[PDB]
Amino acid sequence: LQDEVGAPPALSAEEGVMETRAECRQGLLPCKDNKCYCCIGGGTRQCYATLAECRHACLPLNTN
Numbered sequence: 001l002q003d004e005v006g007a008p009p010a011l012s013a014e015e016g017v018m019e020t021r022a023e024c025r026q027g028l029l030p031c032k033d034n035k036c037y038c039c040i041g042g043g044t045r046q047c048y049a050t051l052a053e054c055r056h057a058c059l060p061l062n063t064n
Helices: 051-056
Strands: 023-026 037-040 046-048
Touching: 046 051
Parallel strands: none
Antiparallel strands: 023 037, 037 046
């Protein structure tokens, strides 16, 4: 059995949860260096490192 996870306080502090696919990496703290924001789950598994997505698809993602 398995239907739970324990993410860090950074990827999930207390500013509202989020679920678009499965799991998402970066796109909050970093959002600058290689591979700005990426999201892996289902029917998606994609990552954007371009400023376009790092500025348009990074802020509204969850960070402020």
